[PDB]
Specification:
This is part of a larger assembly, with two copies of chain A.
Chain A (H helix, E strand, L loop, with lengths): L1 E2 L2 E2 L43
Antiparallel strand pairs in A: 1-2
C-alpha cells in the first residue's frame, strides 16, 4: 500500500498465525482511565438559579 | 483403535474443544497416549 508519500506493507496476522490456538492476540492492547466525581458538594448562594 | 488410512483430508482450521456440541463422543489425549497401541481381537477357531 502507498501512504503519504511512502510505500509500506500491510498484513494482519490473525489468520496465518494465532488461528485456532489458545494464545490471545497481542495487538489488542488495553487503555486505562480513572474517573472521578464529587458526592455531596454544596454550591454557594450565588449559583442556585434555574 | 483409531482409523488406519484416511479417505479425504480436512480443510477447516478451527479450535475443536470449543465445538464439542456437534460431536457424539469426543476424546482428546495430550500427546502420544500409550493406549491407542495395544490391539486385542476375538477369534473363531475351526468349524466342524
Amino acid at each position: 500500500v502507498v501512504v503519504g508519500d511512502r510505500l509500506v506493507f500491510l498484513e494482519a496476522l490473525e489468520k496465518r498465525v494465532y488461528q485456532a490456538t489458545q494464545v490471545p492476540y497481542p495487538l489488542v492492547g488495553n487503555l486505562d482511565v480513572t474517573f472521578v466525581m464529587p458526592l455531596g458538594v454544596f454550591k454557594p448562594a450565588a449559583d442556585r438559579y434555574a | 483403535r483409531p482409523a488406519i488410512l484416511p479417505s479425504g483430508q480436512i480443510l477447516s482450521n478451527i479450535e475443536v474443544h470449543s465445538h464439542r456440541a456437534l460431536f457424539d463422543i469426543f476424546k482428546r489425549f495430550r500427546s502420544d497416549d500409550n493406549n491407542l497401541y495395544g490391539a486385542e481381537f476375538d477369534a473363531l477357531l475351526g468349524t466342524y
